[PDB]
Amino acid sequence: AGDAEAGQGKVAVCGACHGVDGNSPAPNFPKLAGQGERYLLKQLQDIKAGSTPGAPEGVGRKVLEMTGMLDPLSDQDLEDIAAYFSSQKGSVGYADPALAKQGEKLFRGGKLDQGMPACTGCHAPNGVGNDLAGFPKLGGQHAAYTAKQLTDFREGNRTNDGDTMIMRGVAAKLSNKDIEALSSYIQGLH
Ligand code: HEC
Ligand code: HEC
Missing domain, CATH: 1.10.760.10 (Cytochrome c-like domain)
Known part of the structure; x- marks a missing residue:
C-alpha cells in the first residue's frame, strides 16, 4: 500500500492530462480519481514496462502518450501515486x-x-x-x-x-x- 500524501507530490507531470485530482474532462484520458489502488498500481507497473523506450514488444501496456514517463519512478513511488489517485473523489x-x-x-x-x-x-x-x-x-x-x-x-x-x-x-x-x-x-x- 502507498502513502497518498507522498503520491500527491509525485504527479506534477500527470496533471495537464489527468487533472490534478485525477478528474480531467479530456475524453480520451482516463479519470484516475477514486480508482482502486491495486488496479492503479498494476497499470502503472504495466505501463512503465511497456512504454519505456526500447521496451520488448508485447510486454506490459504500451501507452504512447506516456512514453518514458514512469521510468524515473520506483516501485514505492508508483504505490504512492496509486494511493493518491485512489483517495480522490470520482465523478x-x-x-x-x-x-x-x-x-x-x-x-x-x-x-x-x-x-x-x-x-x-x-x-x-x-x-x-x-x-x-x-x-x-x-x-x-x-x-x-x-x-x-x-x-x-x-x-x-x-x-x-x-x-x-x-x-x-x-x-x-x-x-x-x-x-x-x-x-x-x-x-x-x-
Ligand atoms: C497526457 C499526455 C498524459 C500524461 C501527462 C499522463 N498520462 Fe496517463 N494516460 C494517458 C492516456 C492517453 C492514457 C490512456 C491510454 C489508452 O489506453 O487509451 C493514460 C492511461 C493512464 C493510466 C491507466 C488508467 C486505467 O484506467 O487503466 C494510468 C494509471 C495513468 N495514465 C497514470 C498516469 C500518471 C501517474 C501520470 C503522471 C506520472 C500520467 N498518467 C501522465 C495520458 C497521459
Ligand atoms: C470478470 C470475469 C470480468 C468480467 C465478466 C468483465 N470484466 Fe472487465 N475487467 C476485468 C479485469 C480483471 C480487468 C482488468 C485487466 C487489467 O488490465 O488488469 C478488467 C478491465 C476492464 C476495463 C479496463 C478499465 C480501465 O480503466 O482501463 C474495461 C473498460 C472493462 N473491463 C469493461 C468490461 C465490460 C464492459 C464488461 C462486460 C461486457 C466486462 N469488462 C466484463 C474483469 C471482468
Missing part, C-alpha cells in the same frame, strides 16, 4: 439514453447467445469494481476511453490482462455498436 458523466438503454442491457445481461458474460459480476451493478480482486472501477469513466479499451482488448492491442485472460475473451464478442452502447451507459453509472 459521473452523461449517459445518452439513445445509447445507454442498450448499453445497460449488455452490461447487466451479457450476450449469452455468444457465451459472453454480463459485466456486473466483476465490475459491480453500479460499476464500482472490486479492488481487492483488482477489477477496476468503470462507473463514470469517459466513454471514449472505455470504448478504446474494449476495442483494444478485442483487437489484441491491450494484452496486460494475461494474469487472468478475462477481458480479451469478453471483448472478443463485442461489436462496435455494443462498445459504443456500453461505454455510454458506463459514463453515467454509479
